[PDB]
Write a sequence for this structure.
């Protein structure tokens, strides 16, 4: 029980400390935003 | 606040106009969005944005 409680404590500390731990989710949100922005930027193009 | 067709200086478009806190400096007359579409204009009869 003390090991389990201490290991759950280390999860809160880890998530409070680093930004990169959720990179697998932030990359999805970033690719959705980047793909929407690229589609808006192609309204600027002449295409000739 | 009503939707209209508009034409300022030959910039024909469609939309709703609004009094803007976007401070154009005196050399500018049109503002453009990320899409290369105008999103603000300085009226050619009352100098207001
Ligand atoms: C023309 O617009 C100006 C502002 O640029 C305004 O002061 C003036 O009253 C207008 N002209 C006439 C004939 O009213």
């Amino acid at each position: 029980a003390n090991q389990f409680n201490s290991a759950i404590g280390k999860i809160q500390d880890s998530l409070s400390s680093t930004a990169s731990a959720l990179g697998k989710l932030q990359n999805v949100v970033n690719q959705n935003a980047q793909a929407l922005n690229t589609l808006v930027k192609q309204l600027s193009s002449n295409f000739g | 606040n009503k939707c209209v067709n508009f034409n300022f200086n030959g910039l024909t478009g469609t939309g709703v106009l609004t009094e803007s806190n976007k401070k154009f400096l005196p050399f500018q007359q049109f503002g453009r969005d990320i899409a290369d579409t105008t999103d603000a204009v300085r009226d050619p009869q009352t100098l207001e944005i």
Remarks:
- The first strand of chain B starts at residue 3 and ends at 8.
- The pocket of 2-acetamido-2-deoxy-beta-D-glucopyranose is lined by residues B 45 (CB under 6 Å).
- The interface with chain A takes residues 34-37 of chain B (CB under 8 Å).
- The beta strands of chain B are 3-8, 11-16, 30-32, 38-41.
